[PDB]
Motif scaffolding. Structure first.
Motif, mmCIF file in Angstrom:
data_model
loop_
_atom_site.group_PDB
_atom_site.id
_atom_site.type_symbol
_atom_site.label_atom_id
_atom_site.label_comp_id
_atom_site.label_asym_id
_atom_site.label_seq_id
_atom_site.Cartn_x
_atom_site.Cartn_y
_atom_site.Cartn_z
ATOM 1 N N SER A 210 0.826 -1.202 0.000
ATOM 2 C CA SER A 210 0.000 0.000 0.000
ATOM 3 C C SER A 210 0.861 1.253 0.000
ATOM 4 O O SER A 210 0.469 2.286 -0.554
ATOM 5 C CB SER A 210 -0.931 -0.005 1.209
ATOM 6 O OG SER A 210 -1.687 1.191 1.266
ATOM 7 N N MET A 211 2.039 1.179 0.614
ATOM 8 C CA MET A 211 2.925 2.334 0.640
ATOM 9 C C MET A 211 3.456 2.660 -0.748
ATOM 10 O O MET A 211 3.907 3.785 -0.991
ATOM 11 C CB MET A 211 4.073 2.082 1.614
ATOM 12 C CG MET A 211 3.645 2.133 3.068
ATOM 13 S SD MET A 211 4.622 1.067 4.139
ATOM 14 C CE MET A 211 6.145 1.997 4.217
ATOM 15 N N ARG A 212 3.399 1.701 -1.678
ATOM 16 C CA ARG A 212 3.854 1.965 -3.038
ATOM 17 C C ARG A 212 2.996 3.021 -3.721
ATOM 18 O O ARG A 212 3.428 3.626 -4.709
ATOM 19 C CB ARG A 212 3.855 0.675 -3.856
ATOM 20 C CG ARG A 212 4.860 -0.352 -3.372
ATOM 21 C CD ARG A 212 5.116 -1.413 -4.422
ATOM 22 N NE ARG A 212 6.016 -2.454 -3.933
ATOM 23 C CZ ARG A 212 6.960 -3.051 -4.650
ATOM 24 N NH1 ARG A 212 7.158 -2.759 -5.925
ATOM 25 N NH2 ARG A 212 7.725 -3.973 -4.072
ATOM 26 N N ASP A 213 1.783 3.255 -3.215
ATOM 27 C CA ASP A 213 0.911 4.262 -3.809
ATOM 28 C C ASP A 213 1.029 5.608 -3.103
ATOM 29 O O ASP A 213 0.447 6.596 -3.561
ATOM 30 C CB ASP A 213 -0.541 3.788 -3.771
ATOM 31 C CG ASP A 213 -0.835 2.717 -4.800
ATOM 32 O OD1 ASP A 213 -0.096 2.623 -5.802
ATOM 33 O OD2 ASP A 213 -1.814 1.967 -4.606
ATOM 34 N N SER A 214 1.770 5.671 -1.999
ATOM 35 C CA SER A 214 1.830 6.897 -1.216
ATOM 36 C C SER A 214 2.538 8.000 -1.989
ATOM 37 O O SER A 214 3.335 7.738 -2.893
ATOM 38 C CB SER A 214 2.548 6.648 0.110
ATOM 39 O OG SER A 214 2.715 7.859 0.826
ATOM 40 N N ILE A 215 2.233 9.245 -1.623
ATOM 41 C CA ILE A 215 2.836 10.392 -2.297
ATOM 42 C C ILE A 215 4.335 10.416 -2.044
ATOM 43 O O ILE A 215 5.141 10.582 -2.967
ATOM 44 C CB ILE A 215 2.174 11.700 -1.831
ATOM 45 C CG1 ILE A 215 0.646 11.632 -1.956
ATOM 46 C CG2 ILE A 215 2.722 12.877 -2.611
ATOM 47 C CD1 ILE A 215 0.136 11.469 -3.366
ATOM 48 N N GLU A 216 4.728 10.248 -0.782
ATOM 49 C CA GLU A 216 6.143 10.278 -0.436
ATOM 50 C C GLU A 216 6.901 9.166 -1.144
ATOM 51 O O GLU A 216 7.993 9.387 -1.681
ATOM 52 C CB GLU A 216 6.307 10.151 1.076
ATOM 53 C CG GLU A 216 5.764 11.325 1.863
ATOM 54 C CD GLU A 216 6.649 12.549 1.756
ATOM 55 O OE1 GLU A 216 7.860 12.425 2.024
ATOM 56 O OE2 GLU A 216 6.136 13.631 1.403
ATOM 57 N N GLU A 217 6.332 7.964 -1.157
ATOM 58 C CA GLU A 217 6.991 6.833 -1.796
ATOM 59 C C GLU A 217 7.117 7.054 -3.298
ATOM 60 O O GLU A 217 8.177 6.812 -3.884
ATOM 61 C CB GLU A 217 6.204 5.559 -1.492
ATOM 62 C CG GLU A 217 6.804 4.270 -2.022
ATOM 63 C CD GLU A 217 7.964 3.761 -1.194
ATOM 64 O OE1 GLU A 217 8.077 4.143 -0.010
ATOM 65 O OE2 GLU A 217 8.759 2.965 -1.732
ATOM 66 N N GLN A 218 6.050 7.530 -3.936
ATOM 67 C CA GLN A 218 6.079 7.716 -5.383
ATOM 68 C C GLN A 218 7.091 8.783 -5.776
ATOM 69 O O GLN A 218 7.728 8.696 -6.831
ATOM 70 C CB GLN A 218 4.688 8.088 -5.892
ATOM 71 C CG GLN A 218 3.687 6.956 -5.835
ATOM 72 C CD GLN A 218 3.725 6.090 -7.076
ATOM 73 O OE1 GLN A 218 3.405 6.544 -8.174
ATOM 74 N NE2 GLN A 218 4.123 4.835 -6.908
ATOM 75 N N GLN A 219 7.255 9.799 -4.929
ATOM 76 C CA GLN A 219 8.053 10.958 -5.303
ATOM 77 C C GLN A 219 9.479 10.862 -4.773
ATOM 78 O O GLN A 219 10.425 11.265 -5.460
ATOM 79 C CB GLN A 219 7.382 12.226 -4.784
ATOM 80 C CG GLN A 219 6.050 12.533 -5.431
ATOM 81 C CD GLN A 219 6.193 13.196 -6.778
ATOM 82 O OE1 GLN A 219 7.267 13.191 -7.376
ATOM 83 N NE2 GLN A 219 5.104 13.777 -7.264
ATOM 84 N N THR A 220 9.653 10.329 -3.566
ATOM 85 C CA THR A 220 10.934 10.360 -2.873
ATOM 86 C C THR A 220 11.586 8.998 -2.700
ATOM 87 O O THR A 220 12.794 8.885 -2.916
ATOM 88 C CB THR A 220 10.766 10.993 -1.485
ATOM 89 O OG1 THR A 220 9.998 12.197 -1.594
ATOM 90 C CG2 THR A 220 12.113 11.315 -0.879
ATOM 91 N N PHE A 221 10.830 7.966 -2.319
ATOM 92 C CA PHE A 221 11.385 6.657 -1.976
ATOM 93 C C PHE A 221 10.897 5.628 -2.997
ATOM 94 O O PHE A 221 9.776 5.132 -2.914
ATOM 95 C CB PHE A 221 10.989 6.258 -0.558
ATOM 96 C CG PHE A 221 11.497 7.189 0.501
ATOM 97 C CD1 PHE A 221 12.853 7.370 0.693
ATOM 98 C CD2 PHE A 221 10.615 7.853 1.333
ATOM 99 C CE1 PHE A 221 13.317 8.217 1.673
ATOM 100 C CE2 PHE A 221 11.073 8.699 2.316
ATOM 101 C CZ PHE A 221 12.427 8.881 2.488
ATOM 102 N N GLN A 222 11.759 5.283 -3.948
ATOM 103 C CA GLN A 222 11.376 4.451 -5.078
ATOM 104 C C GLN A 222 12.161 3.140 -5.089
ATOM 105 O O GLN A 222 13.111 2.940 -4.331
ATOM 106 C CB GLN A 222 11.599 5.213 -6.385
ATOM 107 C CG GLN A 222 10.773 6.489 -6.501
ATOM 108 C CD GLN A 222 11.517 7.639 -7.162
ATOM 109 O OE1 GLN A 222 12.738 7.608 -7.314
ATOM 110 N NE2 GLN A 222 10.777 8.666 -7.555
ATOM 111 N N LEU A 223 11.738 2.237 -5.975
ATOM 112 C CA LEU A 223 12.442 0.986 -6.246
ATOM 113 C C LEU A 223 12.584 0.126 -4.989
ATOM 114 O O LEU A 223 13.684 -0.103 -4.482
ATOM 115 C CB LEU A 223 13.812 1.264 -6.873
ATOM 116 C CG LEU A 223 13.802 1.847 -8.287
ATOM 117 C CD1 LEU A 223 15.218 2.080 -8.768
ATOM 118 C CD2 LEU A 223 13.069 0.936 -9.253
ATOM 119 N N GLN A 224 11.445 -0.347 -4.490
ATOM 120 C CA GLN A 224 11.442 -1.304 -3.393
ATOM 121 C C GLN A 224 12.162 -2.585 -3.791
ATOM 122 O O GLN A 224 12.048 -3.051 -4.927
ATOM 123 C CB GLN A 224 10.006 -1.633 -2.987
ATOM 124 C CG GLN A 224 9.245 -0.499 -2.342
ATOM 125 C CD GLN A 224 9.533 -0.368 -0.866
ATOM 126 O OE1 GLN A 224 10.390 -1.061 -0.321
ATOM 127 N NE2 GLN A 224 8.801 0.515 -0.203
#
Lengths: 275, 49, 141, 275, 141, 275, 141, 141, 71, 141
Positions: A210-224
């Motif tokens: 679910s965090m993959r859809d978050s704003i911070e994740e999409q913009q700042t924290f990528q490539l899990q």
């Protein structure tokens, strides 16, 4: 803007985890694979607003005691540099810009326009939900509000919308210097009962998705990139062991700094050679 | 595609508007009509040589 | 914190969409464009006096893992024989996961070649290469 | 649908293992290579419905004692992420669908049709055994039953068939988000007599092969990779050692979540520019 | 200590600039030049009596990570269709981070081909190859 | 000119670190990601000219005690050779040249020229800020001053400028012999409170970025590669542990030596064969 | 490189018109002329004293891909049978695409040869040869 | 791209018929015409005053791969010996494959040349040349 | 172009065109290499194509050719 | 693909015979015919009213690799000197390899041209040209 991944995990986990455990329907979907016995016992314990037992989360080496019945434990882990850029330059901006926000607003009736108001100055707009403003609408921003013209849009005086926008601070244009960092962080669930740990780990995997859809994740924290260890006894010197399956989370992010420019050229004079 | 088939001569690309509201969408756009050839005015001058 | 002034696109912020349907388990895609620039050389100059555009050629490739359902053959987008002649053009859209705004769209896509690999130790994969009439990056903010 | 591989192993092993040991003919085929002495002694002990000794299976770190004469031991092992997809998207569905089932049914005589009835709503049909329904048959699904027309099929009022179908829950269309996980799990046989361990390991290899045909394995758990360790003394502090050959099983599976969509467009209105 | 007599250029001492705008998250660039030298062979000699310059061909490539904003398509520097015909020439400058002095500038750059790669496990990248009229290393100290 | 990386780190860190902690605005930008509680507590402690507590920095194995409340610790680390050159030659120079300097100066009014004066002999000029001296200006150097002609530059008698120049020592031309060295150096922050360590590490990352613009870094120490370890208890034999996240810095630099040439040819005589 | 600034007529810049319509799917066009030039020779010297013009020959060639509609046979600009005797002269114009300005015109065009080809995997090619009375380049200035 | 929507006759869309049968294994077909055009010249001026048509020449070529059955010699559409004098005229049609509509017809075809080849590893190629009286394109509208 | 510049003609205007002299020149010093005197036109050819550059060709017949003023 | 089922005569299926023997190391064979077709024209109209046949010309070509034995010169089927006047007519047959059925026959073949080549690293090539009286394709049915 140095990114503290550890803080971000805690900020996202604490609210979302409580919401997931709050309802039963989502838990059933999460624990669809598990057997009936383990599934319901976990649900009897933690699931529901009326759950007497509760889960906790914290960082490593605390001087107090944690709820070893069920707990999430985090530790920072390694970090590495992966990719650079020429002059360490990332981007150039004409405006000092902060975080990117999502806000909800309702249209207001002005004379020539319909306008939305937002909690902070708009700076750079990104999107208003499902509106493709044409040139005749003459979309424009003003302070903390965004405006579009009224005509042939008169049914929308009560339009209810979400807005994505950026925090503006200053007009001081500047450059960005930084690079990309490949960071690893460790997460582990703890219990004195192995079945609880397995259920706990599975719950974690869902909220990571679910965090993959978050704003911070999409913009700042990528490539899990997720990696799971083997279930092990974390502790043996006690009346009973502690069992937990560590997980490793990897991220890609930028360590950026703002460099401000004052050499703004405004005048330009041409003079011919005397000869 | 229509322009590539010569069905329309020209149009504004940026004029389109789209709005979505629950189960409904509003679409607005403009296209320039074709213009046909109507009037011709002619004058003659006779001269020597 | 999240400063949008430095963000970049990745595999987790992009969707590949055809006819509104998001194609599933899509792995990679590459796009090529050739303007066919050529120089003009006079007699009294080794240097090229100017360059001119002559020819527009563009192709896009897509790599996918063959799902048991909704594969490119089952969807009707691809073809395996004379059925191709009845297949009309399509538009392939790359759309942002966050905003659902468009990043780039290919218009009048047509299929060029079709490749599928059956292997023992790895998941099945298939590759398609299309030729398109024009590309567009409109419908932005 | 987070997949608990450990639970799946136990669910498959326990029934199938009992069936294999129940009969003698299959065991002889399995133990064809082994010498006469070891083969029959194992058969004398565990094989047959009238076997006094029995095999057991369980997870690691139990607080009770296991039958160390012969036992299967499982521990979760490592996990890793291998392959992603754009937007983490896997698939799109118009119907909320659960597990995939195989059921047996007999045709029933209706007026215009012959119909099969199944324990649950049909949702998506996959196959009815060795029937290629033509368009004139007009195959269709209704609730928990599947129907095909009667004419020129009249010999089949008593047709006995197997059906492969999916569990339908809701009409709420939604997307799938997830990725692929490469997971490893450990399995080991235990005994105080090495010969029993070797026979026990060989029995395991066969049922792993049979699991390759299972519905769950074919659909969810793919790409087996088996690895065997060396026979070692698991225990030495006792009247006699415990010997066991660990094995490692690898799997490829998807960690999926369901995202539901409510933005269903039904109306579509065109309005021309006022100019 | 820092003796300038032995210093060399690296990725941390260079900037890539277009129209004054520093392009962001640029990764690599390569430059090629061909003078088309050819020899002259007489009858009474296997050796080439002399070499002569005949033709000047030069290309420059740029690799970049597609930022969500100010990508080459959004900046108007590149093109995706007939919009190219209205794009004028540009000058691409490589300038020193320390002094802001110029190291090499390409004049009359024109676009040749455009490549973009969408991949699942890696950041999006795009590549452009330009053809230029002339190069220059003027404006030095 | 053998480069002591460890000394360079200390020389750069000590002044710049004090300046960063001196003001509050920069710290807020640095600690933008961190939560309010940790951010302000650190600011209350060290930030500001009126900070009672202070940070320290030093090398490893000192015989005294360091301020374990907050301290930067450095140790030299590994070194390796990566790239050579033919004859180990790097460069050739006609003048014995030392460091490269940046100095500020104001133009002075001479009769035919405007001249800047610098603390040391100019040797090789590199740049005067934002001046492109034309040939008619007739830019030239003399001793410790640089001169350009006066005409059609008469508005600039008071011009205030920065100058980049090199230290000249001798006219003895010589060659450079050396190679490139890939060196690694370790840096770690120490505290008995983990939150302070995380803030301390983040502060370090920023000044490393700022060092990328330094003259010494741009000219001598290139190609940064940063690597971060996991937070660990450095000490356990005490009333409380010491926690610190080590970081590794990599550099590329030249180990150079000056070889002087005395065989200057000045005369050249041609004599024909007697035959 | 740009549309307006290129000093040279690329194939793209040019448009071909007949009788108030453009010619679709045109591929090639050539125009050849001979002034019937001759040299004057006399007994006094071998060298030619003067040159004169005798006869004017003018021909233009066109190639086209046979569309399913609007071909020359369909459009009446060309004829197969005896209907040719009922076909009058035709005037052709070669036009600047940007502004519809005229570049060159052929007056009094009449047909000489008409060729057609069909092949397994190629596109149908239609060719025609026109002989004209005069060629003029006016209205440019 | 689609069968119906393509404005251009590809080789696939076309079918060739003779006497109520299709021609199998056809490979090529060409039709050439000459109206015998000439220019009128007079003493007054060099320029040609008018153009006129003198003689009509029409020829069509066909190539085919010699089938083991249904060849022109086998089918009687072509002859080798004196039997040619017993062969009447033939009419050829070129047809739209989709709807069996007519595209162009050749009337009064009679044979001029007949060529045949055999080779080690190539396919046997049969060629024939037909001269006709008239060519008409009617019944389309 | 030649048609625009009047060095070549399409219609009857050719009869109003006089002779032309062509020179081939050394770029460095504008010295003459060879000259053609009394050039008059014989053939004029033109081509247009989809993706090629427009090519203009012309053929000139002359009275004499001289290589002088070099020395 | 199979021997019998292929509808087309490949080079392999064909066999060439002369006087009850096969021709070894044959490489090529071509047969050309001209019926001497002409058109009838009259004053009334330009169009040709009719076509007629005037003269029959028939030639066949053969190439062969000169074997060390059984060449045309060795076998007497061809001659070099005055012995040609002592050589009678020859009949050639082209045969189906499977069943020795006849495909086409040439009657009254007489020689026109004989060519021979030798080269450093190539195989010796022998060529010969035959003119015949008639060609018949009978006994097939």
């Amino acid at each position: 803007a140095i990114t503290s991944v550890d803080s971000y995990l805690l900020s996202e986990i604490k609210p979302r985890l409580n919401t997931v455990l709050e309802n039963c329907y989502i838990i059933d979907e999460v624990l669809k694979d598990f057997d009936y016995q383990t599934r319901e016992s976990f649900k009897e314990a933690f699931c529901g607003k009326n759950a007497q037992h509760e889960v906790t989360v914290g960082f490593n080496f605390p001087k107090f005691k944690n709820n070893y019945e069920a707990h999430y434990l985090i530790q920072l882990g390694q970090g590495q540099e992966t990719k650079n850029s020429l002059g360490s330059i990332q981007s150039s901006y004409f405006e000092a810009t902060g975080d990117t926000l999502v806000e909800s607003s309702t249209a207001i009736r002005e004379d020539d326009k319909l306008v939305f108001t937002v909690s902070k100055p708009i700076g750079e707009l990104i999107k208003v939900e499902d509106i493709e403003f044409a040139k005749y609408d003459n979309l424009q921003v003003e302070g903390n509000k965004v405006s579009f013209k009224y005509q042939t849009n008169e049914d929308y005086e009560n339009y209810n919308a979400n807005i994505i926008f950026t925090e503006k601070k200053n007009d001081s244009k500047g450059l960005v210097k930084g690079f990309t960092v490949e960071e690893q962080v460790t997460v582990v669930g703890l219990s004195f009962n192995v079945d609880v740990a397995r259920c706990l780990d599975a719950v974690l995997k869902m909220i990571l998705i679910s965090m993959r859809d978050s704003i911070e994740e999409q913009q700042t924290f990528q490539l899990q990139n997720l990696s799971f260890g083997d279930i092990a006894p974390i502790i043996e010197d006690g009346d009973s062991m502690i069992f937990g399956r560590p997980t490793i989370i990897k991220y890609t992010s930028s360590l950026d700094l703002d460099y401000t420019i004052t050499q703004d050229i405004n005048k330009l004079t041409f003079k011919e050679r005397k000869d | 595609r229509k322009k590539r088939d010569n069905e329309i001569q020209d149009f504004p690309a940026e004029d389109v508007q789209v709005i979505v509201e629950g189960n409904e969408a509003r679409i607005s756009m403009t296209v320039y009509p074709i213009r046909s050839f109507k009037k011709i005015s002619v004058s003659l001058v006779y001269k020597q040589q | 914190a999240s400063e949008a002034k430095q963000t970049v696109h990745t595999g987790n912020t992009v969707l590949l969409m055809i006819k509104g349907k998001p194609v599933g388990r899509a792995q990679s895609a590459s796009g090529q464009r050739e303007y066919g620039t050529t120089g003009v050389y006079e007699i009294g100059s080794i240097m090229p006096q100017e360059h001119v555009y002559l020819r527009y050629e563009g192709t896009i490739t897509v790599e996918r893992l063959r799902m048991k359902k909704e594969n490119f053959a089952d969807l009707g987008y691809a073809s395996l024989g004379e059925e191709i002649l009845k297949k009309d053009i399509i538009d392939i859209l790359v759309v942002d996961n966050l905003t659902k705004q468009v990043i780039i769209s290919y218009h009048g896509c047509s299929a060029n070649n079709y490749n599928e690999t059956w292997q023992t130790n790895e998941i099945v994969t298939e590759e398609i290469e299309f030729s398109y009439l024009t590309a567009s990056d409109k419908a932005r903010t």
